[model samples]
Target: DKLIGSCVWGAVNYTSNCNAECKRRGYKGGHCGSFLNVNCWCET
Candidate 1:
């Protein structure tokens, strides 16, 4: 997984920022995750 530092969001929603980040990096998808702070993760 890759970290998308610019794409933070709440658990209830997904953002195009994360999606674009992942696609730009050649990953299959991206999503928001939690570690107390909302974080964006890219996955293949």
Candidate 2:
């Protein structure tokens, strides 16, 4: 088991963009959310 983390600006603009950015960064998968702003989190 493992826990990976990622950060990206303007994540709320679109979820795919975040995940794609995560993938490009080398994460297995990821998702986007909002903390009243763009939030990006990724998995390994």
Candidate 3:
């Protein structure tokens, strides 16, 4: 949850990299959508 919030608010570009990682891991890009949705809501 905190990580997602950090990506949403932080300028670290974690969300973008996460999305890329997700794709690399064989997950769909749209499955993540935005940082807060997947990294926070779903994962949390």
Candidate 4:
């Protein structure tokens, strides 16, 4: 048998302007790393 899991969302704060930069680049939403705020892209 295989295991299954549920999806959930968490909150975070962007210390630098990376998040904003990502948005400018056209990233929808995902996990942004602590320092860099690297935007994780969503699949279409």
Best by lDDT: 1
lDDT, model 3: 0.39
RMSD of each: 5.6, 6.2, 5.7, 12.3
Ranking 1 against 2 by TM-score, winner: 1
Worst 10 residues of 3 by lDDT: 35-44
Q: Write the per-residue lDDT of candidate 1 for residues 1-44, one digit (tens) a residue.
A: 66655454444544557767787879887664445235567765
- lDDT for 30 in candidate 2 is 60
TM-score of each: 0.51, 0.45, 0.34, 0.30
Please report how far candidate 3 places residue 24 from its true position, in Å. Answer: 0.2
lDDT of each: 0.62, 0.50, 0.39, 0.33
Worst 10 residues of 2 by lDDT: 1-10
Candidate 3 structure quality by residue, lDDT tens digits, 1-44: 12332234354533545545555555444223343353422222
Model 1 residue runs over 4 Å out of place are: 9-16, 34-37
Better of 2 and 3 by TM-score: 2
Q: Please state the error at residue 40 of candidate 4 in Å.
A: 9.8
